[PDB]
Design a protein around this motif. Structure first.
Motif, PDB file in Angstrom:
ATOM      1  N   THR A   1      52.578  26.413  57.972  1.00 21.05           N
ATOM      2  CA  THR A   1      51.856  27.539  58.611  1.00 21.05           C
ATOM      3  C   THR A   1      51.003  27.021  59.752  1.00 21.05           C
ATOM      4  O   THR A   1      50.900  25.799  59.905  1.00 21.05           O
ATOM      5  CB  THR A   1      50.947  28.202  57.564  1.00 21.05           C
ATOM      6  OG1 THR A   1      50.141  27.184  56.958  1.00 21.05           O
ATOM      7  CG2 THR A   1      51.765  28.889  56.453  1.00 21.05           C
ATOM      8  N   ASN A   2      50.409  27.920  60.551  1.00 21.75           N
ATOM      9  CA  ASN A   2      49.596  27.505  61.690  1.00 21.75           C
ATOM     10  C   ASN A   2      48.145  27.963  61.512  1.00 21.75           C
ATOM     11  O   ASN A   2      47.861  29.133  61.469  1.00 21.75           O
ATOM     12  CB  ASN A   2      50.182  27.957  63.031  1.00 21.75           C
ATOM     13  CG  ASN A   2      50.910  29.266  62.945  1.00 21.75           C
ATOM     14  OD1 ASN A   2      50.364  30.292  62.587  1.00 21.75           O
ATOM     15  ND2 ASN A   2      52.165  29.243  63.287  1.00 21.75           N
ATOM     16  N   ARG A   3      47.208  27.039  61.380  1.00 16.94           N
ATOM     17  CA  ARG A   3      45.839  27.290  61.223  1.00 16.94           C
ATOM     18  C   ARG A   3      45.176  27.751  62.518  1.00 16.94           C
ATOM     19  O   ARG A   3      44.789  26.946  63.349  1.00 16.94           O
ATOM     20  CB  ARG A   3      45.397  25.902  60.860  1.00 16.94           C
ATOM     21  CG  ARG A   3      45.527  25.572  59.355  1.00 16.94           C
ATOM     22  CD  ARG A   3      44.820  24.232  58.962  1.00 16.94           C
ATOM     23  NE  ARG A   3      45.529  23.043  59.494  1.00 16.94           N
ATOM     24  CZ  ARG A   3      45.176  21.785  59.251  1.00 16.94           C
ATOM     25  NH1 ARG A   3      44.136  21.491  58.511  1.00 16.94           N
ATOM     26  NH2 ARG A   3      45.887  20.809  59.756  1.00 16.94           N
ATOM     27  N   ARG A   4      45.063  29.064  62.667  1.00 17.53           N
ATOM     28  CA  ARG A   4      44.449  29.687  63.853  1.00 17.53           C
ATOM     29  C   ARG A   4      42.961  29.345  63.983  1.00 17.53           C
ATOM     30  O   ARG A   4      42.338  29.607  64.999  1.00 17.53           O
ATOM     31  CB  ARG A   4      44.625  31.221  63.843  1.00 17.53           C
ATOM     32  CG  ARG A   4      46.009  31.741  63.445  1.00 17.53           C
ATOM     33  CD  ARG A   4      47.066  31.427  64.485  1.00 17.53           C
ATOM     34  NE  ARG A   4      48.370  31.961  64.067  1.00 17.53           N
ATOM     35  CZ  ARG A   4      48.818  33.189  64.316  1.00 17.53           C
ATOM     36  NH1 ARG A   4      48.119  34.093  64.958  1.00 17.53           N
ATOM     37  NH2 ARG A   4      50.013  33.509  63.903  1.00 17.53           N
ATOM     38  N   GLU A  13      42.304  34.903  70.656  1.00 15.68           N
ATOM     39  CA  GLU A  13      43.095  35.743  69.772  1.00 15.68           C
ATOM     40  C   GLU A  13      42.579  37.166  69.739  1.00 15.68           C
ATOM     41  O   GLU A  13      43.348  38.109  69.769  1.00 15.68           O
ATOM     42  CB  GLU A  13      43.055  35.151  68.372  1.00 15.68           C
ATOM     43  CG  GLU A  13      44.349  35.311  67.583  1.00 15.68           C
ATOM     44  CD  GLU A  13      44.335  34.537  66.265  1.00 15.68           C
ATOM     45  OE1 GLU A  13      43.246  34.339  65.680  1.00 15.68           O
ATOM     46  OE2 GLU A  13      45.425  34.098  65.823  1.00 15.68           O
TER      47      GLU A  13
END
Length: 26
Positions: A1-4, A13
């Motif tokens: 996953t991508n840690r925003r 964002e």
């Protein structure tokens, strides 16, 4: 996953997810 949570995201964002359609105003 991508840690925003990388951090630019407070501006980045929130801006692109919303300001393209509604006011960036609070």
């Amino acid at each position: 996953t991508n840690r925003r949570k990388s951090g630019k995201y407070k501006k980045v964002e929130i801006k692109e997810l919303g300001e393209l359609r509604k006011e960036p105003s609070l």
